[PDB]
Amino acid sequence: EVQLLESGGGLVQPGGSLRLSCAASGVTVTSNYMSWVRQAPGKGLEWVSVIYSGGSTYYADSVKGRFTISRHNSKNTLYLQMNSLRAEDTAVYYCARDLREAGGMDVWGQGTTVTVSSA
Amino acid sequence: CPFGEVFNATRFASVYAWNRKRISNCVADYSVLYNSASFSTFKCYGVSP
Amino acid sequence: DIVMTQSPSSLSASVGDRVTITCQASQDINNYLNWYQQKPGKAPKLLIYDASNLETGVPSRFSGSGSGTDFTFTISSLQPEDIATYYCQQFDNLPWTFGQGTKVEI
Amino acid sequence: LDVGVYSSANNCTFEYVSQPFLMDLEGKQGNFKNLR
Amino acid sequence: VIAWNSNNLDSKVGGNYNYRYRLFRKSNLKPFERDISTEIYQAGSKPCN
């Protein structure tokens, strides 16, 4: 029943548009917490962005204006279109159903990597 | 404005039982609020202090 | 902002040695630190939350403790399955930055 | 009022109380002394 | 906004755990609303019995 599947990712160039998306079932993205997070190779986890309940958008420092987030309850999906990317953005990204402060990232999926190499 | 009795109260309710009341028909005391040495921050965002 | 300066990053020991992990923070973490098991290349798995309660499924060989500046993680029975990178995370001061984690390999 | 005014209240924005007042609630036929 | 520390009034040596907040709520905070519903959300496939 409940499931959060991942879509998107590839070998987009820096400054090149790409679309990452997390499709949820069993929850409501618009009126509940959900988040996207990166993990750099050789580095620990890095928080990216959250969507709250009540139309309040909060981002990280480096993705304040580079990502674009939009949510839909028709299929319970969250979309982030990323443009004007940077080379450092190559990292493994996850969409998570974060539930405040009771143990962070208790539930994990697979996660998809994004390589922003010029090759 | 009837403030002194309320401000020096022992304890107010929790965040879920946050208190919201309508206020009219009294006078503010900005100078005493600023210099009382018992109020830490007086922040006015939408209006000019 | 709360940032943790954890001295150990990659420690190597023999089989059966105790595992002691210490994670120091710049400010006081109020019973609000986590300990995970992430395994070589695998996704992190949360074991210890809210610094005092155990989750159903976590082996008894793992223990976490701490309330304040000091936080400790203890493993008494060393196993090859414990070769991993243990992270300390503070979900206390926004933004909730993650930790670097010390890597134990035997 | 005898000697349920409201069942529920929502979006409450004003309550007013004047000085304490002491009246008589006896029901009787006769002359009325007060005029309002 | 007037904010001030209450170490003298709302701080106990033994630990003050009186302030609690809520996780699950469906509707957004409409203007001038006070809702005291105790609904628990079924945010997965296993019902919360």
DSSP of A19-84: EEEEEEESS-STTS-EEEEEE-TTS-EEEEEEE-SSS-EEE-STTTTTEEEEEETTTTEEEEEE-S
**Residue carrying structure tokens 């089989």:** C15
Nearest chain C Cα distance for residue A103, angstroms: 5
CA A8 vs CA A20, A35, A54, B29: distances in Å: 5, 16, 27, 58
Nearest CA in chain D to E30: D11
**Residue carrying structure tokens 């503070």:** C90
- SS3 state of residue C9: coil
Residue type, D31: N
Which residue in B25, B10, B29 sits closest to E2, CA to CA?
B29
Nearest chain E Cα distance for residue D12, angstroms: 9
Which residue in C20, C106, C101, C17 sits closest to C62, CA to CA?
C20
CB B34 within 8 A of CB B42: yes
Q: How many CB pairs under 8 A join A and E?
A: 25
Nearest chain E Cα distance for residue B8, angstroms: 8
Q: Does E32 touch chain D (CB under 8 A)?
A: yes
Dist. CA A40–CA A62, nearest whole Å: 13
CB A90 within 8 A of CB A41: yes
Is the sign of the CA dihedral C27, C28, C31, C37 positive or negative? positive
Residue type, C66: G
3-state secondary structure chain E: CEECCCCCCCCCCCCCCCCCCCCCCCCCCCCCCCCCCCCCCCCCCCCCC
What is the bridge-based pairing of β-strands C53-54 and C45-49?
antiparallel
How much of chain C is in helix, strand and coil states, percent to nearest 5?
Answer: 5, 40, 60
Which residue in A60, A50, A54, A3 sits closest to A26, CA to CA?
A3
Mark yes or no for CB contact A108/C44 under 8 Å: yes
CB B34 within 8 A of CB B41: no
Sequence-distant (6+) residues with CB within 8 A of A38 are: A45, A46, A48, A89, A91, A92, A93, A94
Sort out which chain C residues have CB atoms less than 8 A from A46's CB and list them.
Answer: 97-98
CB A70 within 8 A of CB A79: yes
Furthest C-alpha separation in chain B: 32
Dist. CA A56–CA A48, nearest whole Å: 15
**Resolution, expressed in angstroms to one decimal:** 3.9
CB C71 within 8 A of CB C48: no
Dist. CA E28–CA C36, nearest whole Å: 34
CB count within 10 Å of CB B20 equals 8
Which residue in E35, E24, E45, E46 sits closest to A32, CA to CA?
E24
Tally the residues of chain B.
49
CB B1 within 8 A of CB B27: yes
Mark yes or no for CB contact C49/A105 under 8 Å: no
Cis peptide before C95 (omega within 30 of 0): yes
CA A53 vs CA A18, A31, A57, A77: distances in Å: 26, 4, 9, 15
3-state secondary structure C45-94: EEEEECCCEECCCCCCCEEEECCECCCEEEECCCCHHHCEEECEEECCCC
**Residue carrying structure tokens 């002194």:** B4
